[PDB]
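Continuing from yesterday's entry. The apo prediction looked reasonable, so today I'm repeating it with adenosine-5'-diphosphate included to see how the binding region is handled. Same sequence as before; SMILES copied from the compound registry.
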Amino acid sequence: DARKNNIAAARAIADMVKTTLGPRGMNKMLVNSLGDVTITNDGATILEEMDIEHPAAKMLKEVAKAQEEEAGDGTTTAVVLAGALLEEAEKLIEQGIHPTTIIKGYRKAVDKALEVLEEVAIPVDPDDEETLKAVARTAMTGKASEENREEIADLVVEAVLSLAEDGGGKYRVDLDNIKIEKQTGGGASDTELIEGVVLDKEPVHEDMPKKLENAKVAVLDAPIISISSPEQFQAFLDQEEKQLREMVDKIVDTGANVVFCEKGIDDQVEHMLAKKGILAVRRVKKDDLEKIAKATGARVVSNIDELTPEDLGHAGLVEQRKKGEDRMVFVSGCKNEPVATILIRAATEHVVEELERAIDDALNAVKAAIKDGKVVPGGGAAEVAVARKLREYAKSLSGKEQLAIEAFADALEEIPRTLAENAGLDPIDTLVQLRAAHEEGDKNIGIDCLTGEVADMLEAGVIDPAAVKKQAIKSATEAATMILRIDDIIPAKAPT
Amino acid sequence: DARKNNIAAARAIADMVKTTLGPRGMNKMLVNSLGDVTITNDGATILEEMDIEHPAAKMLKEVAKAQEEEAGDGTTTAVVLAGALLEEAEKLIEQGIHPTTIIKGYRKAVDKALEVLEEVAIPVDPDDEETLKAVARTAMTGKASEENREEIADLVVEAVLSLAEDGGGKYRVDLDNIKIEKQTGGGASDTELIEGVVLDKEPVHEDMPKKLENAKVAVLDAPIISISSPEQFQAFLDQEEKQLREMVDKIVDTGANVVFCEKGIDDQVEHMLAKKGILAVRRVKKDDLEKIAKATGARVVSNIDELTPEDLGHAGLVEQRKKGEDRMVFVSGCKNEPVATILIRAATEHVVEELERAIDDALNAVKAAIKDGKVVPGGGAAEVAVARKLREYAKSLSGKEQLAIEAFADALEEIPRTLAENAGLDPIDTLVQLRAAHEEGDKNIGIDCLTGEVADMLEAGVIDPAAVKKQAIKSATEAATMILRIDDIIPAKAPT
Amino acid sequence: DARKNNIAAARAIADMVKTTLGPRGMNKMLVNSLGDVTITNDGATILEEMDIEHPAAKMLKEVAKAQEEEAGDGTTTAVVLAGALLEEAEKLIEQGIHPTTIIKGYRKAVDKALEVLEEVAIPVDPDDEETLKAVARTAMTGKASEENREEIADLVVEAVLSLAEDGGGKYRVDLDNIKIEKQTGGGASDTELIEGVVLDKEPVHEDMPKKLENAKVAVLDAPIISISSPEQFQAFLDQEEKQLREMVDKIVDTGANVVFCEKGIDDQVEHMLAKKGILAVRRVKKDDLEKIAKATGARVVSNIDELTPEDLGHAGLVEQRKKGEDRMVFVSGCKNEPVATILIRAATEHVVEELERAIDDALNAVKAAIKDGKVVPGGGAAEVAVARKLREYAKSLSGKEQLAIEAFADALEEIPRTLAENAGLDPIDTLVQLRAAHEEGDKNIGIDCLTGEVADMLEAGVIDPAAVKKQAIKSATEAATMILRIDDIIPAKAPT
Amino acid sequence: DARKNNIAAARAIADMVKTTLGPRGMNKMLVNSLGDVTITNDGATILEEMDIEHPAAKMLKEVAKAQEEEAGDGTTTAVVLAGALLEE
Ligand SMILES: Nc1ncnc2c1ncn2[C@@H]1O[C@H](COP(=O)(O)OP(=O)(O)O)[C@@H](O)[C@H]1O
Ligand SMILES: Nc1ncnc2c1ncn2[C@@H]1O[C@H](COP(=O)(O)OP(=O)(O)O)[C@@H](O)[C@H]1O
Ligand SMILES: Nc1ncnc2c1ncn2[C@@H]1O[C@H](COP(=O)(O)OP(=O)(O)O)[C@@H](O)[C@H]1O
Ligand SMILES: Nc1ncnc2c1ncn2[C@@H]1O[C@H](COP(=O)(O)OP(=O)(O)O)[C@@H](O)[C@H]1O
Ligand SMILES: [Mg+2]
Ligand SMILES: [Mg+2]
Ligand SMILES: [Mg+2]
Ligand SMILES: [Mg+2]
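Holo prediction written out below.
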C-alpha cells in the first residue's frame, strides 16, 4: 500500500508541524550533521531545512514554497489542513469509497469553501488604524516575545504608512524597502527609518573621513612577472602604482569619495584610498550590492574606465556610529528609492532570527491586508464558520459526495482543535463550545491563546487577512489531492 | 519457463501503467537516485524514464517509442492492450494451444480489427468546429486541471485554425510551430500567438535598446601570450580590441543590431556590444538556435567574415517585458515562418510539465484528426464495438483459431474495464451494461469518467482520432507477438 | 486468503483423481506407513483411504460418501466436476464477482442442467438385451482387463435376469445377493450362480461328512477350578463333557448336522463334533454370519437351550471341492433367499480387488438402469450437450449471472477434456470437434477411449445410466458451493 | 519524550555545575583528547570548553555567553537556577 505509505509520511510531517500553529506554538529544534542549531517556530523554516527521504513528503516542500511565494504566510495552516484532509481521506478509503470520488468531493467542497470565505469576510478600509494594528499583531503572533508585541506592531504600521509609495493604490511596501539593521543585544527599538542601506562592516582606515555631508557616492564591483635587471621589479611596481594613480585620478575627476566594493581589498589599496579620503567596503553581496546601487543612485560600473560625473550618486550623510558593540558605517541619506535589507536586532542569535522572520511575516500580512482589503476573523473562527456552511451544503447535496464534503468539513474543523490544543485548553470541549457558539448566528467567536479562553476575536484583535486563509485552503487541497492521486513508488532512471 | 518470466515482466509493466488510463488516471511518481521527482500521468514518460533490468520489459521501451513516433498518442492504451493480450495468451498456453497458433489467431484477429475499426469510424470535416473541439478536449483529457479544459481546448483550436498553413490540404501544424512561453505562476492564458520565438533570458546590458522596431536581426554561433617589454601586453590588448572593432564594424556595415548567440559572453564583450546598442543572448541550444534562425530569417553564420546585408534578417519588434517574475525578451515579429518551442506556463513545476505534455498531446491529436479526417468514439466504445464484431467473426470461424480470436476480443475488452475501474465504477457491471447496449445496435455508448456514468460519447464530446486507436491496436499486437516469440534468455557476448 | 487455500486443496485432490477418469484411467498407488500397498483406479477407494490433513479437503470425504450412498457410481466424475467448478469460481473471483452471486448462478445452472439432462436422456426398456449389455460394459469399464469385458458383462446380465426378484417392478438385485467366491489364480469364469453362501474355511475334521444332501443346517454363535482330592479334576472333566454331551444331544434331537459358528473352537470340541459328523466353521464375521442365517433359514440362536426342530434350516447340498489351491466347503442349496458376499476371483491380489470393485460397480449400474429406466450417452457426450444447452440459457439470460452460467458450462465441458486426455488424444482439438459435432444437431457423438477416436456412442456401446450423471452433477454442485461458502480457518475447542 | 530528554540533559549540566557555586566551590577539571588539563571553578570556563553533543544542552552555551556579555558575573547562578526551574 504505497498510497498508505505516502499518507503516513504526510501525516508524520503534519503532526510534526502541528505543534507550532498559534501564539503558543511550541518551537522546534533544527539540528544538522555540522552541529549548528537554530530554534524556530514559523513553519516555513521547519519545512525548508528538514531532511525528507520520502518523496511524497518531498512534494510538501514544493507546496510550502508555492504558499510562501504567493502569500508568504499560512504555510503551517496549509500543512496542518493537508494532514487533516489526508486523515479523513484515508478514513473514507477504508470505508470503501474510491479515491477519485474523494478527489471530486474535495474539489467541490473547496470551491464552495472559497466562496463561503468570500461571503463571511468582513471588509476593511486602509485608514482604520486599529484594524491595521490588529491585523499586524495577529500576523506578528507566534514568534516575537510577549513584551514587545505592541512596540513592533506600532513600528510596523508606522513604517507601512510613512513609506507608503502610492503606486496607483497598490502600495509597493516590499520586504527589502524598510530600514532595519542587525546587531546582537540592545533591543528592537532600533527598527527606525534610516534613509539608506547600512552595511555591517567597519571602515578600512581610521583617518578615512567618517562624516561626509552631500557625499558623491559611487558603487563599484571590480577587485580593488619576469625580472631581468635589478631595478626591473621596481619598474613594474612603479607602473602599477602609476596606472592605479591614473584610474583613481579619473575617478576623483568625477568626484567620488564614498565607495562600496563587491570584492576584497589590499592594505596598500586601502592605504592609498584613504590617502585621498575614500570609503571602501568589501565583500558586499550581490543582492545587497544591487540594493545599495538602487538606493545611492550610483549605477554599478563593471567597466570603470567609462565612469563619469553623471554616473555618480549622492547621499545626504554617511557616518560611523559606535552603536552597541560592533562598529558599523551607519549610512543615512539615500534619497532615490526606499531600499533595505532584512536584518533586525534582538538579544541572542535565536531571538535575532526569530524576530527577523516575525517582522518579515508582519509586513507581508499588512501588505496583503492593504492590497486585498478583506480581513477574516482568525483564531479558528473562519475555519468553524466555513465548516458549518459546508455542512449545510452537505445537507443540500446527496450521495457519496456528501461523505467527502463532510470529511472536508471535519478536516477544516481540525485547525481550531490544534490551535486550542497548543493553548492548553481541552480540544473537544472548546471545539464543541465553538460549534455551539457559531450555531447561535454570531461569526467572530474563536480561540484567543494569549488569554487562554474562547472570546470574540474582533474585540480581542485577532484577525488574519482573507487571502492568506484562501491560499491556505487552496494549497492544502492541492497537496491532499496530488498526494492521493499517486499509486506506487517506482525507480526512475537517473538523467546521465 | 523463461517465456513465463517475460510474460510476468510484461504483466508487471502493464499493471503499473494500467492505473493511468483515462481522465481520472491516478498519477505516478518518478524518483531517481539523484532525488529529483516528477509527477507524471502520460504513459510516455512513465515508460521512458523508468528502470527496467528485464530485457523482455526493455522491448516495451521500443514499442512505446514506435507508438510515439507514428501516432504521438496512445502509448498507455498500447501497453495495456499488450498486457491484456498476454493475459489471455498465458491462459491459452495453459490450456495447451501451441504458441504459433496463438500468434496466427492474433494476426488474423487484428487484420479484421483494423478493418472493422475502419468501417465503424464516423467521418469528420475540417470545418465542424464543435467536433474538432470535442476531439481536442478528449485528447487534452487526462493531465490538465478540470478548470482550464474549455480554455486550453479553445486556444488549441484557435492556434490550429489561425496558423493553418494550407500545404495542399495537409496543414503543417507542427509541435514547434505554435507560440507559447514557459514561466512559473500566472496562468495558461498566455498561450497566445506571439509572432516570434521568445527566449527566457535577460538583456546583458541595461542600456541595451529594449525596443527596436523593424530591427535588423542577425543570428550568430561563434563565441563572442608572451610578454617581453612592459607595453607588449598593452599592445596585445590593443590589437585584440582593434580586430574586435573591425569584425563588429563590418557587422554594423551590414546593419545588425539584434543578435542571439549560441555560446557565452564576457563582461567587456557585452559592454562593447551595448556601446553601439547590440542585443546578445547566450547559451542558446542547438534546436532553439535553429528555430530562431528559421523564424528571424538570418541564416546561421559560423564564418562571420562573410556576413553581408543580404544575410541579415528582419523582425517587426523586439521588446523586454517584465511579465510575471522572470525578466525575458519578448521577441515578436518574426515574419518568415511559424516557429516556436514547447514551453508553457502553469502554477508549479510539476503542473508546468503536466500542462506542457497535455498541450503537446492536444496539438498531436487535432493534427491527426485534420490529416486523416476519421474519428472513432472513445471511452472504450470503439473497443467494445470491435470486440463484438470480433466475436461475430469467431462465430463464423471454426477451429482452434476461434479460441485465439476470442482471446483477442477479451484482451481488447480489457481497456473499457480499466477505464471504468479508474473512474470508480465497478468494472464487471458497467462492462456488462456496455455489452448489452452495443447489442441493441447503437455504437456510441461508452464510459465518461468526468460524469462517472455510462452515456453516449458523441453527445458527451468524448471522441478520439481513428488513427490513434488503429496504431494502438497494431503496436499492442506487435508487442504481444514478439514477446511471445521468445523462448529463453542466454548471455550474449558484449561487443568489444 | 483461506478461501484460496481451500480452493487449492480441492484443486489438488481434483487433479490427483482426474487421471483415473475413464477406461484408460492411469491407476493410483496407495502406500501406508505399515507398508501395505493396494493398486486401485476407482476414485471411491482413492478418496476413502488417502490421508488428508486439510479440513476443506476432508469435506470431500463426505461428498464421496454421499455419492456412493445414493448412486454408487460417479465419485470421480463428481470430484472432477467440483474441481472444474472451483477452477472457474476462482477465476470469477479474480475478475471481481462476489461469491454469493457465483453460488446463485451455479444453483440456477444446476437446476437447468438437471432439467436438460432429463430431456436429453434416451429411455430404455428392461428387455432390450443389447442396451443392458452396453450399460453394463460402460460401467464395468475402467478397471476390468480388456480381455474379459464381454465375459463378465455377460455374467452380469445373466445374474441380473436370473436372480430377478420381481418385487413389484423394482427388482431387489442387491450387491450381497449374487454368488461369487474369491480365490487366487484361475479366472473370472467362476462367477456362477451357486445357490448358497460359500465360506473360505476348511473342514475342521477329515472324517467330517463332506457330502450331506438335504442336510439339517443350523446356525450358532456361542463359543463351542478348585481341586481338593486327586480325582476332583477328573470329576470336573467328566461333568464338563457330560453337560457338553447333553447340549449336543438336544441339538441332535433337533437333527442339526451342519453348523457355521461365529467364534473359535477347540481340538476336543471339533473331535466330538465330528464323532457324530457335525460340520463347524469358525470365526465367521457378523455380516457373513447374518448372510448365512438368511440363506440357510436357521435363525441365529444365541441361547442354544431353546433350539427346536422348527428352528433348524435345510440345504440341498454341502460339498468340499478342492477347486484351485485352497481347500473350501462349496456350500450350495440354500433355497430360502438369494444371499451372498462380494468375493471374486482373479490372478493376483491387486487384480482380485480390482475385479471385485468392477463387478460391484457393474451390478450397481445395471440395477440403477433397471430401476430408473433412463440412460444418457456417456463418453463426455452428455456433458457437451448439457453445456451447449446451458450456453443457450446464458444467451437467454442477461446480467452477471450469465458469467457464472458460462463458468458452469466450461466446468462441465472439463470432463470430456479429461476423458480425452487420459485416452491420449489432444484435449483442445477433440473438445472443439465435439462442440462442432453437437452444433450439427446430433447428440450421441462422444469419445471412445478403447478405439481412441471420436465416434457415435450409441453404436459403440458406451452408455452410462442417467441417474448416475444426475447425482454426479448434484454432488459436484454441493461440493463446490459449500467449499466456496467458507471464509477462514479458526481453531475449534476440542470436546472433552 | 524528547522534552524529557532535553530536560534531562539540562539537569545533568545543572548538577555538574551546581558543585562550583560559592566560596568553597569544589573545582572541576577539563581534560581533552590532547591531554591538556586546566583546573577551574568559575562556571564560565566550565560551560565554555566542555563537550556537549546534546543540542538542547548546546543552547546553554548561548545562555552563558549572553550572561557573560551583559553582566560578566553569574553564569553558575544562572545555570543552577535553570536547573531548579526545569526540576519544578
Ligand atoms: N492572537 C491570536 N490568538 C489566537 N490565535 C491566533 C492569534 N494570531 C494568530 N492566530 C492563529 O494562528 C494562525 C496562523 O499561525 P502562524 O503560525 O502565524 O502561521 P504561519 O506558521 O504560516 O506563519 C491563524 O490562522 C490564526 O488562526
Ligand atoms: N473524456 C473522456 N472520458 C472518458 N474516457 C476518456 C476521455 N478521454 C479519453 N478517454 C479514454 O482515455 C484513452 C486515452 O488515454 P490517455 O492516457 O490520454 O492515452 P496516452 O496515455 O497514450 O496519452 C482513450 O482511448 C479513451 O478511451
Ligand atoms: N467405454 C467407454 N468409453 C469412453 N468413456 C467411458 C466408457 N465407459 C465410461 N466412460 C466414461 O467414464 C465415466 C465414468 O468413469 P468411472 O471411473 O467408471 O466412474 P467411477 O470412478 O465413479 O466408477 C462416464 O461418465 C463416462 O463418460
Ligand atoms: N563570601 C561569600 N559567602 C557566601 N556566599 C557567597 C560569598 N560570595 C559570593 N557568594 C555567593 O556566590 C554567588 C556567586 O558565585 P560565583 O561562583 O562567584 O558566580 P560566577 O561563577 O558566575 O562568578 C553569589 O550569588 C553569592 O550568593
Ligand atoms: Mg502565519
Ligand atoms: Mg492519450
Ligand atoms: Mg464409474
Ligand atoms: Mg560569580
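Comparison notes:
- Chains A and C do not touch (no CB pair under 8 Å).
- The first strand of chain A starts at residue 28 and ends at 31.
Will overlay with the apo model tomorrow.
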